[PDB]
Amino acid sequence: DQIPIILIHGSGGNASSLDKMADQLMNEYRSSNEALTMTVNSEGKIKFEGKLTKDAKRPIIKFGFEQNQATPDDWSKWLKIAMEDLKSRYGFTQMDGVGHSNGGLALTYYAEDYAGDKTVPTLRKLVAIGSPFNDLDPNDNGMDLSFKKLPNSTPQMDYFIKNQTEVSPDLEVLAIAGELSEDNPTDGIVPTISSLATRLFMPGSAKAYIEDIQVGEDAVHQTLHETPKSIEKTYWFLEKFKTDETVIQLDYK
Questions:
Q1: Distance from C-alpha of 21 to C-alpha of 18, rounded to nearest angstrom
Q2: Which CATH number fits the domain that encloses residue 172?
Q3: Which Gene3D superfamilies match (predicted)?
Q4: What DSSP state is assigned to residue 152?
Q5: Fewer Cβ within 10 Å of end Cβ, the chain: N or C?
């Protein structure tokens, strides 16, 4: 009945990439008291470092993909394999996840593809930080933060829309997006709208869907999972936010 929190890096990252967040949860908030590092390689290896005890509180799973530039749907498949082993070892029926960029996309595939699967933990809270739901092309995304549709949906977005019905009705989603300035709706890599495109498939599927836009030069893609606001909002969503009713909160902005 412990609910772990899985932390997943962006492309180019590793199992240490979300350590600022993890250290804050373990050392300052002290809402989590134990951690495990797990890594997976598509070659066929799964590695656990550490052991969670019976006294674990919100245990953190620092996750690493050795193939750290692969597609988010490949990541999701590899995550499933590793989550079968995690559940086998510890029995967790639910987990929360925080993913930076590609890591948030991997969680979204996991949410859509394995909600019914009793051999892995069901994703409960999903935090996606600068995740390019509709990839990187500004032409596909545009600049209208009140968007009800995208200028052009990519194949990935088409998949997310098609399979939105498969998410757990208890799923709670927080989409964090950066915008370098009000007149420059990108985080430097991802169009702000791409990172909020969850708006088009999570509301009414998930129990909760919340957006948070951070603005300014400090909201750059590469470090967006390290901003004070990102960490504060993530803590809030993981430890304070609770609902039985549907919640949808959009930033327009």
A1: 6
A2: 3.40.50.1820
A3: alpha/beta hydrolase (3.40.50.1820)
A4: S
A5: N
CA distance 87 to 94: 9
Is residue 157 classed as helix, strand or coil in its secondary structure?
helix
Cα separations in angstroms, 79 against 17, 23, 234: 17, 23, 21
- Count of other CB atoms within 10 angstroms of residue 77: 18
Closest by CA to 249, choosing from 175, 145, 156, 169, is 175
With 0-12 CB in 10 A as exposed, 13-18 as middle and 19+ as buried, what is 129? buried
Tally Cβ neighbours within 10 Å of residue 47. 13
Residues 118, 92 contacting (CB under 8 angstroms): no
Q: Return the number of other C-beta atoms located less than 10 Å from residue 188's C-beta.
A: 16
Segments forming the whole domain that contains residue 244 = 1-253
CA-closest candidate to residue 35, choices 59, 1, 9: 59
Q: Which DSSP letter does residue 237 get?
A: I
Cα separation, 211 vs 192, whole angstroms: 11
Please tell me the distance from the alpha carbon of residue 144 to that of residue 164, in angstroms, as a whole number.
23
Provide the number of structural domains found in the chain: 1
Backbone angles phi, psi at 64, to 5 degrees: -135, 135
Q: In whole angstroms, what is the distance from residue 212 CA to residue 102 CA?
A: 18
CA distance from start to end of the chain: 38
Resolution, given in Å to one decimal, reads 1.8
